Design a protein around this ligand. Structure first.
Ligand SMILES: C[N+](C)(C)[C@@H](Cc1cnc[nH]1)C(=O)O
Ligand SMILES: [Cl-]
Ligand SMILES: [Fe+3]
Ligand code: NA
Length: 444
């Protein structure tokens, strides 16, 4: 039916974060990332940076482990680290504007970084077993460091999965039980649905009993006018029509910045398509397969907007407030079990046909607002009123309130943890590739 053999534990309310439940959730966070890292066949592949805007894979093998250690030291739950050189080397990731910036380090051996991981795992597990979990946990409790570490690791499962997908298939091995969604399927008609206007409140209250990142908090009331939105995410088959109507070759659908990006990278189609013998194949995590015509297309923001340009007629993307209104209405009590109703949390090992998951239609009538692939939004990443950086990670989001990052919401098939729930806010530079697609909007 769907992926079952590789299983991801649902997140836990801070009022239920018992020592036993957290041990299980920590072990699961870490085992999942181990399964992903073990899919690289040859240790020399760890010195490749398959995405030219991100670090070599060796860095991501050590990074999630160093992050836990650094934050437990900062709250004084650990009195010393495991390797101070590695805790520096693996500390900070990257967000360059171009490949040259990043290109401009002696990495350790792969076996030395696995050793570091295994030692860190045992040190953290002992902290967990030796600390009292006085419920409830909260943002001024030292164990917030541990909750932050587990979510950071699950976020890096998702962003590392995109790096492994950019390696040649011959360099990776599919883990036992990895299961893609059914792919045969021509898409259904993608109808425009009227979403009735109303008021939404964005943000998260300080004492909400769920872990979250600083940029999730605050309070913003927004009056949202009615709008039309496509009931499905734009599919591979819809986007193939744009390609066949010279979408990548027509300047008027683009703008100068996005056209420059397209030309510089010689782009003729979405990143994970290849044209051979008269037809497109598609690169799933570990295998090439015939293009799944009814799955959501995966594009960066530039490509999403070019398709909007081809549609014409004021076609555009949703704002953050518009997505929230469509997904959650005007209400809200999170029900964590509802994550099972969407293509989230490794329900599948890939995107799914739009509409296949029959529980995934929001009350507004739109399908896969939650799950399947993130959806891009026409919204510069920005703080909500009441935003405050957290002492444990002051630079988490504030550097990126710079009008150079667009938002995306709702989670993908690969998304885990509190990132699958209502409050998480995601953001990327508009040229970046994620497990991410879009739907189209018109005012009238
Ligand atoms: C919020 N995104 C997903 C854009 C972040 C998450 C993150 C990882 N390590 C620190 N923050 C990113 O990938 O830079
Ligand atoms: Cl919910
Ligand atoms: Fe990180
Ligand atoms: Na979505």
């Amino acid at each position: 039916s769907h992926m079952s053999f590789i299983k991801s534990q649902l997140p836990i309310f801070l009022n239920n974060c018992t020592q036993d439940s957290v041990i299980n959730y920590f072990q699961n966070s870490w085992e999942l990332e181990n399964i992903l890292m073990r899919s690289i066949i040859d240790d020399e592949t760890f010195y490749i940076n398959p995405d030219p805007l991100r670090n070599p894979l060796i860095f991501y093998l050590g990074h999630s482990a160093a992050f836990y250690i650094n934050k437990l030291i900062r709250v004084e739950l650990l009195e010393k680290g495991i390797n101070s050189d590695y805790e520096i080397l693996f500390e900070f990731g990257v967000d360059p504007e171009n490949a040259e910036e990043l290109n401009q380090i002696n990495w350790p051996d792969v076996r030395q970084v696995w050793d570091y991981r295994n030692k860190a795992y045992e040190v953290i597990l002992e902290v967990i077993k030796n600390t009292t979990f006085d419920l409830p946990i909260h943002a001024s409790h030292p164990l917030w460091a541990l909750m932050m570490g587990m979510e950071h690791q699950r976020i890096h499962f998702e962003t590392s999965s995109m790096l492994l997908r950019q390696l040649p298939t011959e360099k990776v091995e599919k883990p036992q039980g990895w299961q893609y969604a059914p792919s045969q399927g021509v898409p259904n008609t993608n109808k425009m649905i009227l979403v009735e206007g109303g008021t939404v409140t964005l943000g998260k209250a300080k004492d909400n009993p769920l872990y979250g990142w600083d940029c999730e908090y605050g309070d913003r009331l927004v009056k949202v006018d009615s709008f039309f939105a496509s009931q499905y995410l734009v599919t591979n088959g819809e986007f193939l029509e744009f390609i066949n109507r010279k979408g990548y070759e027509t300047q008027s659908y683009w703008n100068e910045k996005s056209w420059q990006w397209k030309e510089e990278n010689k782009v003729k189609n979405p990143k994970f398509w290849q044209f051979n013998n008269g037809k497109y194949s598609y690169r799933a995590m570990f295998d090439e397969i015939p293009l799944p015509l009814d799955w959501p297309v995966e594009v960066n923001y530039y490509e999403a907007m070019a398709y909007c340009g081809w549609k014409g007629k004021g076609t555009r993307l949703m704002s953050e407030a518009e997505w929230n209104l469509a997904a959650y209405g005007s209400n809200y009590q999170v029900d964590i079990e509802k994550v099972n109703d969407y293509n989230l949390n490794l329900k599948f090992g890939s995107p799914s046909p739009v509409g296949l998951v029959k529980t995934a239609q929001s009350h507004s009538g739109l399908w896969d607002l939650r799950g399947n692939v993130w959806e891009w939004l026409d919204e510069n990443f920005h703080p909500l009123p009441g935003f405050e950086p957290h002492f444990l990670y002051e630079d988490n989001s504030a550097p990126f309130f710079d009008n150079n990052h667009k938002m995306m919401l709702g989670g993908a098939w690969v998304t885990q943890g509190t990132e699958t729930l209502k409050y998480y806010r995601n953001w990327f530079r508009p040229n970046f590739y994620q497990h991410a697609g879009f739907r189209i909007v018109t005012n009238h």
